Design a protein around this ligand. Structure first.
Ligand SMILES: Cc1cc2nc3c(=O)[nH]c(=O)nc-3n(C[C@H](O)[C@H](O)[C@H](O)COP(=O)(O)OP(=O)(O)OC[C@H]3O[C@@H](n4cnc5c(N)ncnc54)[C@H](O)[C@@H]3O)c2cc1C
Ligand SMILES: Cc1cc2nc3c(=O)[nH]c(=O)nc-3n(C[C@H](O)[C@H](O)[C@H](O)COP(=O)(O)O)c2cc1C
Ligand SMILES: Nc1ncnc2c1ncn2[C@@H]1O[C@H](CO)[C@@H](O)[C@H]1OP(=O)(O)O
Length: 609
C-alpha cells in the first residue's frame, strides 16, 4: 500500500452497461460473497451489476454515479475489532470522514455484517449508512444489520427478499441457472504452468522472495510441535515456526495467519462420489471478459488442488449454493428440499437451519445424504467459497525469539448432529506437521494488542484456556525487560483450565517465570477440581481491592484473551463491579469508566469464536 487505484468505477459501469455496483468490506470473504450474490441478482430484475473491492477504487467517483440512469450503489460491510472497517475498507472509511463532496442524486443501500457479542455491533455498516445520507445521497432501502451470533445467512435472506421489491418499485422495473465461469480442460499443459496450491504468483511457494504477506505467504519450517496438555480429553498443541531470513517483523500481541490444506480423504471422497477425475488439469474462465477476476481461484490447476488448497469444503454450504445445486438432484423430493433452503420462512428455512447449519453438514455430507444430488465437478468448484487463512495469537516475544513465531491452539474435532466427526481444517493440518521438512505458509498481521510502552506500567492479563497464547509472549518479554535491567511494574496473570493434571498449559514455563519473579502473581482457576466452577473472574473479584489500586492509581493496563461469547463478558462485568464498589459509583458510571479504559488503550481484547 498504497495500492494503485483502478480507473473510475462509474466509467467502467458506463462502458459495460451496468447500473448497480455492490462494494464489499470483507476480511473472511462473507461480505464479498453477499456482494457477489446481490450483483448477480440484478440480472433477474432487468438490471446489470458488478461487485467491487472499494480499496481498488476512489469512492469520490460516487458523485458521478447519477450520470447513469436508474443507478444504485450497495455496500455490504463487515466490522472488525473496536468497530473498525475491514482492512480493504480503510481508505473508504477515511475518505468518508474527511470528504465534503456532495452526493445529491446518489441512491444507496447498506447491509452490515457484524456480531452482537461485540461492543461496536455493525459499527461500520451503521457509519456508512449514516455518512452517505449526511453527504446528500438518498437511502433506497433500510440498513441491514446481520448478526453472526444468530444466523447471518438468514438475516441476509430476509433483507435481500425485501430489498429487490423496493428497488423494482422505486425504479419501476420488473422481475434460469447462469454460470459465471466456463470450463476449459487442458490436455497438453506444461507442468510449469499448473498451480499446485500457491496463493499468488505461480511457483511463489517454491521460489520465495520477500516481502511476505497475505498474497505471498512465507513457508515457515515447523521446528517444534508438542502436546501441551497432560490429559487426553482434548489435544492442545504448541508449535514453533521458523521465520529466519523472511525479514518478517512481529511483536507480542500480533497474529500469525496460516493457509492450511483440507483433509485428503475428504477431497478424495468428493471426487469419488461425483465420479470425477480429480487429476484433470483445467481453468474456470470468467464469461465476462471485462472483469479483473479471471478465475475463481488460481488456474490452471487440478480439481484435487482446488479442493485441497483453494476451496472451503467443510463449512455448511450457504443457501444460494444449495439452490443452484438443486438442478442436479434427480429425486424430486431432494431437488425440492435443496430449492427451499433459500426460503425466508417456513419449513424450508427450518430444514436449512437444522439439517444443514445445526447439524454442520458439509458438502460431502449433503452429497451422501441426498444421493440423487450429483453435480458436475466444475460447477461445484465455481460455487464453493474460498478456503480462508486461520489466525492465531503469536505466543512468543520477538525480543526473545526474533526468528520464531509460536502458536498455541486446541485441535478441533467434534461430534456433529449430522452423525459424523468433523475435523478443524487448520488445526488438523497443523497437528499433523512433524518437525523435520514440514512447511507452513504464513504471514503476520499487526494488531493493537500490546504491552505498555513504559516497562513500569502494571499489567493485568486474563486468559483462560487457549487465551493464554499472547501472554506467554508478554511474560517472556517482561522477563527479558527485567533481565535487561529495566524497572518492571507488577505483572499479574489470571489463567484458568479444567484441572492441573489435565490441561494446565505451559505449567512448567509459568512456574519458572513465577519463581524468577517475572510474574508478580500466578492466579489459576481450576474450573473442574471441585463441585463448583472456579473461573478467572472469581479470582479477579477476590483480588478486587488490589486490582482497583493498580487500575485507578497505578495506571495498569488490562488484557483479556480467549472466549468472546461468555468469558470476556463475564470478566468485563466483574471489572464493572470492582469499579462500582471502589470508585465508588453506580453501575452505570462504572460501565462508562471501564469503556473509557478501552478507548484510552488500557483495556485490550483478543477474543474469538
Ligand atoms: C484473532 C483471532 C485469534 C485467534 N487465536 C487463536 C489462538 O491463538 N489459538 C487457537 O486455538 N485459536 C485461535 N483462533 C481461532 C482460529 O483462528 C481457528 O478458528 C481455530 O483454530 C479453528 O480453526 P480450524 O480450521 O481448525 O477449524 P474450522 O474448520 O475452521 O472449524 C471451526 C468451526 O467449527 C465449528 N465447531 C467447533 N466445535 C464445534 C462444536 N463442538 N459443535 C458445533 N460446531 C463446532 C464452529 O463453526 C467453528 O467456527 C483465533 C481466531 C481469531 C480470529
Ligand atoms: C477479530 C474479529 C473481530 C470482530 N470485531 C467485530 C466488531 O467489533 N463488531 C461486530 O459487529 N462484529 C465484529 N466481528 C464479526 C464480523 O463482523 C462478522 O463475523 C462478519 O460476518 C465477518 O465478515 P467477513 O467474512 O466478510 O470479513 C469480528 C470478527 C473477528 C473475527
Ligand atoms: N464463562 C466463563 N468465564 C470464565 N471461564 C470460563 C467460562 N466458561 C468456561 N470457562 C473456563 O475456561 C477454561 C478454558 O475453557 C475452562 O476452565 C473453562 O471451564 P469449564 O469448561 O469447566 O466451564
Amino acid at each position: 500500500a498504497p495500492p494503485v487505484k483502478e480507473s473510475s468505477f462509474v466509467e467502467k459501469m458506463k462502458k459495460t452497461g451496468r447500473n448497480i455496483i455492490v462494494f464489499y468490506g470483507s476480511q473472511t470473504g462473507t461480505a464479498e460473497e453477499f456482494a457477489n450474490r446481490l450483483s448477480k441478482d440484478a440480472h433477474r430484475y432487468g438490471m446489470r451489476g458488478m461487485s467491487a473491492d472499494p480499496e481498488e477504487y476512489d469512492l469520490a467517483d460516487l458523485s458521478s454515479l447519477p450520470e447513469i440512469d436508474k443507478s444504485l450503489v450497495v455496500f455490504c460491510m463487515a466490522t472488525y475489532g473496536e468497530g473498525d472497517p475491514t482492512d480493504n475498507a480503510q481508505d473508504f472509511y477515511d475518505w468518508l470522514q474527511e470528504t465534503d463532496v456532495d452526493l445529491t442524486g446518489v441512491k444507496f443501500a447498506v447491509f452490515g455484517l457484524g456480531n452482537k457479542t461485540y461492543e461496536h455491533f455493525n459499527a461500520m455498516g451503521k457509519y456508512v449508512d449514516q455518512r452517505l445520507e449526511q453527504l446528500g445521497a438518498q437511502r433506497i432501502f433500510e440498513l441491514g444489520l446481520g448478526d453472526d451470533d444468530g444466523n447471518l445467512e438468514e438475516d441476509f435472506i430476509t433483507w435481500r427478499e425485501q430489498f429487490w421489491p423496493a428497488v423494482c418499485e422505486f425504479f419501476g422495473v420488473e422481475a434460469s441457472s447462469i454460470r459465471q465461469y466456463e470450463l476449459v480442460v487442458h490436455e497438453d499443459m506444461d507442468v510449469a504452468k499448473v498451480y499446485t496450491g500457491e496463493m499468488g504468483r505461480l511457483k511463489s511457494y517454491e521460489n520465495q522472495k520477500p516481502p511476505f504477506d497475505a498474497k505471498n505467504p512465507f513457508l515457515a519450517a515447523v521446528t517444534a510441535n508438542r502436546k501441551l496438555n497432560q490429559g487426553t480429553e482434548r489435544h492442545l498443541m504448541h508449535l514453533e515456526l521458523d521465520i529466519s531470513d523472511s525479514k518478517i517483523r512481529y511483536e507480542s500481541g500480533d497474529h500469525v495467519a496460516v493457509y492450511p490444506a483440507n483433509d485428503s480423504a475428504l477431497v478424495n471422497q468428493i471426487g469419488e462420489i461425483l465420479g470425477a477425475d480429480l487429476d484433470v488439469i483445467m481453468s474456470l474462465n470468467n464469461l465476462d471478459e471485462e472483469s479483473n477476476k479471471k478465475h475463481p481461484f488460481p488456474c490452471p490447476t487440478t480439481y484435487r488442488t482446488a479442493l485441497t488448497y483453494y476451496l472451503d469444503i467443510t463449512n455448511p454450504p450457504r443457501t444460494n449454493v444449495l439452490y443452484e445445486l438443486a438442478q442436479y438432484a434427480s429425486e424430486p423430493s431432494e431437488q425440492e428440499h435443496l430449492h427451499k433452503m433459500a426460503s425466508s420462512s417456513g419449513e424450508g428455512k427450518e430444514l436449512y437451519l437444522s439439517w444443514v447449519v445445526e447439524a454442520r453438514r458439509h458438502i460431502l455430507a449433503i452429497l451422501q445424504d441426498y444421493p440423487s444430488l450429483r453435480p458436475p465437478i466444475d460447477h461445484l468448484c465455481e460455487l464453493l467459497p474460498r478456503l480462508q487463512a486461520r489466525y492465531y495469537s503469536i505466543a512468543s516475544s520477538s525480543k526473545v525469539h526474533p526468528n520464531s513465531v509460536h502458536i498455541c491452539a486446541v485441535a478441533v474435532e467434534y461430534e456433529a448432529k449430522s452423525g459424523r466427526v468433523n475435523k478443524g481444517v487448520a488445526t488438523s493440518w497443523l497437528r499433523a506437521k512433524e518437525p523435520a521438512r514440514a512447511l507452513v505458509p504464513m504471514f503476520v498481521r499487526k494488531s493493537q494488542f500490546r504491552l505498555p510502552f513504559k516497562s513500569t506500567t502494571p499489567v493485568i492479563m486474563v486468559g483462560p484456556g487457549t487465551g493464554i497464547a499472547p501472554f506467554m509472549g508478554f511474560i517472556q518479554e517482561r522477563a527479558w525487560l527485567r533481565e535487561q535491567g529495566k524497572e518492571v511494574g507488577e505483572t499479574l496473570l489470571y489463567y484458568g483450565c479444567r484441572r492441573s493434571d489435565e490441561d494446565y498449559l505451559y505449567r512448567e514455563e509459568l512456574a519458572r517465570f513465577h519463581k524468577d519473579g517475572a510474574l508478580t502473581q500466578l492466579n489459576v482457576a481450576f474450573s473442574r477440581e471441585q463441585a463448583h466452577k472456579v473461573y478467572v473472574q472469581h479470582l479477579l473479584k477476590r483480588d478486587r481491592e488490589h486490582l482497583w489500586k493498580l487500575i485507578h492509581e497505578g495506571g495498569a493496563h488490562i488484557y483479556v484473551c480467549g472466549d468472546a461469547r461468555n468469558m470476556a463478558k463475564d470478566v468485563q462485568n466483574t471489572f464493572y463491579d470492582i469499579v462500582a464498589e471502589f470508585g465508588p459509583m453506580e453501575h452505570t458510571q462504572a460501565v462508562d469508566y471501564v469503556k473509557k479504559l478501552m478507548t484510552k488503550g488500557r483495556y485490550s481484547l483478543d477474543v474469538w469464536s
